[PDB]
Design a protein around this ligand. Structure first.
Ligand SMILES: [Mg+2]
Ligand SMILES: [Mg+2]
Ligand SMILES: [Mg+2]
Ligand SMILES: [Mg+2]
Ligand SMILES: [Mg+2]
Ligand SMILES: [Mg+2]
Ligand SMILES: [Mg+2]
Ligand SMILES: [Mg+2]
Ligand SMILES: [Mg+2]
Ligand SMILES: [Mg+2]
Ligand SMILES: [Mg+2]
Ligand SMILES: [Mg+2]
Ligand SMILES: [Mg+2]
Ligand SMILES: [Mg+2]
Ligand SMILES: [Mg+2]
Ligand SMILES: [Mg+2]
Ligand SMILES: [Mg+2]
Ligand SMILES: [Mg+2]
Ligand SMILES: [Mg+2]
Ligand SMILES: [Mg+2]
Ligand SMILES: [Mg+2]
Ligand SMILES: [Mg+2]
Ligand SMILES: [Mg+2]
Ligand SMILES: [Mg+2]
Ligand SMILES: [Mg+2]
Ligand SMILES: [Zn+2]
Lengths: 213, 99, 82, 132, 129, 218, 82, 71, 22
RNA sequence: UAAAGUUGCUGCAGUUAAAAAGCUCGUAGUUGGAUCU
RNA sequence: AGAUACCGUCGUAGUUCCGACCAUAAACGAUGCCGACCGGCGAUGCGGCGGCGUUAUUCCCAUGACCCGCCGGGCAGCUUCCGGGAAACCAAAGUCUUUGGGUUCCGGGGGGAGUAUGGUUGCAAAGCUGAAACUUAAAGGAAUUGACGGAAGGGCACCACC
């Protein structure tokens, strides 16, 4: 953010945050995530400070834009909740997606077919994407993670606090991270609303697709 | 080498626990160490339930239950297959079997 | 590094972690060197240079890398106050 | 036991991924295609490979398969995945908000939001599963 | 019971530095502790510290720069002459290029180099490098 | 002919990285021995410290394999240690040499007293540990040579240390642990925060950032 | 953790801490001005009073000792001093 | 742990000598029973009169007759 | 031989020795 | 005598390799919190 | 086969209480005591401090029973690349060759041997203290593979069974 008004959160972004339910964390708080929550509702649920989430998102975008080769960013999702969002983010920005199962040794074993050497790693859930997180610790690979209130922070360098359990919230953060990196890069203006809308990044939930058809 | 952190018993914070007797072999075993099982069973088994209900004099009598607390010494527990041996990692699980 | 004569007799000068000031060893592959692209104050666009931080493996293992990078960016003006 | 060996399965997967356009649901055309595009030194092995290719064609007909990866098929798959509703699910006339998140938004300087509807909070502080 | 407050202070700062923390609080404080922290100051190993005045015994909040490898105490506080100072620094210090032995002489509290300059021996307190 | 697979190998072969110290600066893992052969091929020597037969008991007999320990390093600034176990002794030695090349670490050398001439001894007292074996290197005056056991002496001479005092504790009869401990002590020489390294670091560009486009088109 | 200001503790967590474990120890007790239901004149009472405080201008019992804070008689009002 | 105070010299010395008595070589050299029981009486060599020639069985893993003499 | 029974046998031997040197 | 940091003041060990008294009290001994230019 | 045993029947001393001895246990956490620092998490027992909201009551404050936290002293548990360790494992068995907070006991290859002897305590049994000659290249600890088991689970076969 940098106290710049042009990079400050707007009313529309806040409304999308609240509609997606990003501020709604979990019933447990990791001690390394305490500086991101506001207070704890009487249902046991923690509320995430959305200003601070916006700041961490902007920092992650600044880290992403700082890599000259757009294909040298690796975007990983293991749960089905974030696979579509990850693929859309890769198509929009230019990163390399790994949707589905992460084969161990992708970073260490150079004989493997999928062997790659990224310069930045973005994951949807540090708990569910622990294998790439620990593999990054072998190849000097910085990591960006979407963290919940109970998300462990080992080997996580830029943590964006949010609700990474719901489909809408995960899709919304991947969509806004793409928007932020595109805006910083030079494509897309900050005044015209982005054409791509966040529902394109949402998990389709096959039983919902069947009703859709 | 130590096999179990709790030494196979549940004695923490005290010096002595009262001895009890194995229901099978009548062995003196500390109460915390002994393997205890609470059996609630129908007095009449399911095979004779129909005969008992047909030959009853009341309506909806509901057959009584039997409540027995069995205390077993480790040797008897293993021999009677009440408890089994497990792997070095499976030993740490204290969750009771689903059953 | 310096002898009495005045020249630097050393193979190389290693980097130090920007969070803990520890020397980052030659074979310590959990360490990272992040680059963060700062933005111009008018158009909100990447302008070309950046600010760089380096974190050792121990800090990352303890989970303190996130807070350390947050504070380093805050002191640099990258992250707004509060 | 009619369990196919890895020879048959890998051969069929490679054949399908390479020549998906030429194949179909017919065993007797698939076996000719296999004998034309591949070198299988046995007729029984050719028949087994063609049968598994037919089975896999039927499988891909109703969705994806973990073994196959067809480059042209992925474009159509993401085209189906490009579904966009008319109205965004995040565009709501009124969104319910707890008093605590309302206070947080006020501290954010976004307390002037109108779509927020401050719902009543919970009464009982019973959100934990009983132990035992 | 607690004896030799200096040992506790040095252990606390050593443990905080091993852990990578930027500030450490030491309690109780003492004039010996303050003099030791100041000789650590003048050589750039510690950083700025602040004394909190509780009416019983103060506390010290010490800022930490990662330049401190070890700091410890030597108990008992043996008497050191000028002749034996070389043996003591050979035993305790990691090199002749850096590291300091702290001692109380009649001239005050100072490192072994200043004690050599002033030609005074004393009692050893601790060391840091 | 060498055809690199890793990014670092491509950069090294393409005359983009000029020194091994640039790789050491960014703590990049080295996974191709041709990099070491390209940078220090002329000056590298190897020395098979030990061949040990290990045995695995089986239903019929003992299956025997051979473990080779190989120390490598030009006698100026660099050294490496490698352990490889294989069914044939020659294969084991070849693999151990490859591993020793992959494990080359830089050695920091200092002065005992006056800083006149080139560095000749360890910067300060350092310690390495590997399974009950503790090895301590102490700075020594010029011309004192290496006062150590033969096994650490080989590695210390191979690294480039001219003068050194040594103290070892534990079961040094296990050559592998002794060698790994002295290797660890040697490796710690550039991780000790001495006052001459207190100056704030100036961060440069990593090879992956300096040559992003060249890697893109190659 | 790591960079946590021990010099400037926050008031909420300073009250959260034990009385002897603060930066400067501050007692948790206080002195109250207690008004009887009928008597016009107030009495100074210790919050954690260990004695049965009697009204100096009457026979009314003002507070009863307990494990911690003393229990005021029903109707007897009180205001915190200073 | 051991005592470390400035006035603990007597305790340290007394403990060291008492524990020194638990060393096999030290006790053998300083107790005086070994020298009394030694047939040479502490000498490096001795002179004797041959009593008889004897053959001694070698220990179990190797079979041989060692030719000795009673002196 | 079990240590307990070895101690028992040694105690029997001691008892015999004490009774013999009355 | 060194090797023996296998007598350990420097400088060893005591869960399982040899090893912490069954437990507590207690004289001598040893050690002993800030504070005074 | 034998059984001076394991199984069964009877059954003395004892097992029980009081008064005097005995002072030994795998008397075990096989881990001295005092003090400081060093990660998280959820529980639990006692005491205190707060807070909606339910219950005893039917209305009054109460004070009890729950519920959500905080503090302190405990019995512990899970977790962790704190760090240690030969490892098993240990948040102490960490803050140790970067070796010093105070202080008690105590070990020094395996046997002979906790034996002989002297002393001392005890009615006794025995307790405490406690050698040497001589003998020996290992004894021992953790952990890895096999082999075996009268341990537990599965699976297979008309050279098994049905
Ligand atoms: Mg066993
Ligand atoms: Mg108790
Ligand atoms: Mg007991
Ligand atoms: Mg030694
Ligand atoms: Mg040996
Ligand atoms: Mg000697
Ligand atoms: Mg020596
Ligand atoms: Mg020893
Ligand atoms: Mg033992
Ligand atoms: Mg004990
Ligand atoms: Mg006394
Ligand atoms: Mg004093
Ligand atoms: Mg008989
Ligand atoms: Mg009987
Ligand atoms: Mg005993
Ligand atoms: Mg004992
Ligand atoms: Mg309570
Ligand atoms: Mg209350
Ligand atoms: Mg508690
Ligand atoms: Mg020590
Ligand atoms: Mg004691
Ligand atoms: Mg012995
Ligand atoms: Mg006698
Ligand atoms: Mg005794
Ligand atoms: Mg074993
Ligand atoms: Zn039994």
């Amino acid at each position: 953010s940098g106290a710049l008004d042009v990079l400050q959160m707007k009313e529309e972004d806040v409304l999308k945050f609240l509609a997606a339910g990003t501020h709604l964390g979990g019933t447990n708080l990791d001690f390394q995530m305490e500086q991101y929550i506001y207070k704890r509702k009487s249902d046991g649920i923690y509320i995430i400070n959305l200003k601070r989430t916006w700041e961490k998102l902007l920092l992650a975008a600044r880290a992403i834009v700082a890599i000259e080769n757009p294909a040298d960013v690796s975007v990983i999702s293991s749960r089905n909740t974030g696979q579509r969002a990850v693929l859309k983010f890769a198509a929009a920005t230019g990163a390399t997606p790994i949707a589905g199962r992460f084969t161990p040794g992708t970073f260490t074993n150079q004989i493997q077919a999928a062997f790659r050497e990224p310069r930045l790693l973005v994951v949807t859930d540090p708990r569910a994407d622990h294998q790439p997180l620990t593999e990054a610790s072998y190849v000097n690979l910085p990591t960006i993670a979407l963290c919940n209130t109970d998300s462990p922070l080992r080997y996580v360098d830029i943590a964006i606090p949010c609700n990474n359990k719901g489909a809408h919230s995960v899709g919304l953060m991947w969509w806004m991270l793409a928007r932020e990196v595109l805006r910083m890069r030079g494509t897309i203006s900050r005044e015209h609303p982005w054409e791509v809308m966040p529902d394109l990044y949402f998990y389709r939930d096959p039983e919902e697709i069947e009703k859709e058809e | 080498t130590k096999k179990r952190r709790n030494n196979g018993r549940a004695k923490k914070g005290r010096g002595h626990v009262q001895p009890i007797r194995c229901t099978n072999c009548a062995r003196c075993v500390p109460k915390d160490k002994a393997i205890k099982k609470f059996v609630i069973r129908n007095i009449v088994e399911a095979a004779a339930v129909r005969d008992i209900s047909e030959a009853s004099v009341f309506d909806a009598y509901v057959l009584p239950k039997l409540y027995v607390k069995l205390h077993y010494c480790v040797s008897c527990v293993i021999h009677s297959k009440v408890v089994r041996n497990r792997s070095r990692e499976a030993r740490k699980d204290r969750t009771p079997p689903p059953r | 590094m310096q002898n009495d004569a005045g020249e630097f007799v050393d193979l190389y000068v290693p980097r130090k972690c920007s969070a803990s000031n520890r020397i980052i060893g030659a074979k310590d592959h959990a360490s990272i060197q992040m680059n963060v692209a700062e933005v111009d104050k008018v158009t909100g666009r990447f302008n070309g240079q950046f600010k760089t931080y380096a974190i050792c493996g121990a800090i990352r293992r303890m989970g303190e890398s996130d807070d350390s990078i947050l504070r380093l960016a805050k002191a640099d003006g990258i992250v707004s106050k509060n | 036991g009619r369990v196919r060996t890895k020879t048959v399965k890998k051969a069929a997967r490679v054949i399908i991924e390479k020549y998906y356009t030429r194949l179909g649901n017919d065993f007797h055309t698939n076996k000719r295609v296999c004998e034309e595009i591949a070198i299988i030194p046995s007729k029984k092995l050719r028949n087994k490979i063609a049968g598994y290719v037919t089975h896999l064609m039927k499988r891909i007909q109703r969705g994806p398969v973990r073994g196959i990866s067809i480059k042209l098929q992925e474009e159509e798959r993401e085209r189906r995945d490009n579904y966009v509703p008319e109205v965004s699910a995040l565009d709501q006339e009124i969104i319910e908000v707890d008093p605590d998140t309302k206070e947080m938004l006020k501290l954010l300087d976004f307390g002037s939001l109108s779509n927020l509807q401050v719902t009543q909070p919970t009464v009982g502080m019973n959100f934990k599963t009983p132990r035992g | 019971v607690r004896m030799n407050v200096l040992a506790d202070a040095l252990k606390s700062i050593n443990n905080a530095e091993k852990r990578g923390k930027r500030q450490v609080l030491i309690r109780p404080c003492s004039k010996v502790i303050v003099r030791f922290l100041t000789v650590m100051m003048k050589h750039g190993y510690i950083g700025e510290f602040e004394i909190i005045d509780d009416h019983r015994a103060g506390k010290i909040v010490v800022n930490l720069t990662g330049r401190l490898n070890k700091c410890g105490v030597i108990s008992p506080r043996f008497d050191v002459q000028l002749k034996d100072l070389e043996k003591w620094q050979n035993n305790l210090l990691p090199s002749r290029q850096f590291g300091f032995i702290v001692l109380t002489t009649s001239a005050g509290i100072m490192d072994h180099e200043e004690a050599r300059r002033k030609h005074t021996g004393g009692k050893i307190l601790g060391f840091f490098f | 002919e060498w055809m690199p697979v890793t990014k670092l190998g491509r950069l090294v072969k393409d005359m983009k990285i000029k020194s091994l110290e640039e790789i050491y600066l960014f703590s990049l893992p080295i996974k191709e021995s041709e990099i070491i052969d390209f940078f220090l091929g002329a000056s590298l020597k190897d020395e098979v410290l030990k061949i040990m037969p290990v045995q695995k008991q089986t239903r019929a007999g003992q299956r025997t394999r051979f473990k080779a320990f190989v120390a490598i390093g030009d006698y100026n600034g660099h050294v490496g240690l490698g352990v490889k176990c294989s069914k044939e002794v020659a294969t084991a030695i070849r693999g151990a040499i490859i591993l020793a090349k992959l494990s080359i670490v830089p050695v920091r050398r200092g002065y005992w007293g006056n800083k006149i001439g080139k560095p000749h001894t360890v910067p300060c007292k350092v310690t390495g540990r590997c399974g009950s074996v503790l090895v301590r290197l102490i700075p020594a005056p010029r011309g004192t040579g290496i006062v150590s056991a033969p096994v650490p002496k080989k590695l210390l001479m191979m690294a480039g240390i001219d003068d050194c005092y040594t103290s070892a504790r534990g079961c040094t009869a296990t050559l592998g642990n002794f060698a790994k401990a002295t290797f660890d002590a040697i490796s710690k020489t550039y991780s000790y925060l001495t006052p001459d390294l207190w100056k704030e670091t100036v961060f440069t560009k990593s090879p992956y950032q300096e040559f992003t486009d060249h890697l893109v088109k190659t | 953790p790591l960079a946590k200001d021990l010099l400037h503790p926050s008031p909420e967590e300073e009250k959260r801490k034990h009385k002897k474990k603060r930066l400067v120890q501050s007692p948790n007790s206080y002195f109250m001005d207690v008004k009887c239901p009928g008597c016009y004149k107030i009495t100074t009472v210790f919050s954690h009073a260990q004695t049965v405080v009697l009204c100096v201008g009457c026979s009314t019992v003002l507070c009863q000792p307990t494990g911690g804070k003393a229990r005021l008689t029903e109707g007897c009002s009180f205001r915190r001093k200073q | 742990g051991k005592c470390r105070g400035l006035r603990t010299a007597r305790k340290l010395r007394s403990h060291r000598r008492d524990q020194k008595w638990h060393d096999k070589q030290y006790k053998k050299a300083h107790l005086g029973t070994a020298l009394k029981a030694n047939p040479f009486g502490g000498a490096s060599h001795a002179k004797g009169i041959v009593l008889e020639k004897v053959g001694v069985e070698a220990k179990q893993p190797n079979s041989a007759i060692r030719k000795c003499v009673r002196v | 031989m079990r240590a307990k029974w070895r101690k028992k046998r040694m105690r029997r031997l001691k008892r015999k020795r004490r009774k013999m040197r009355q």
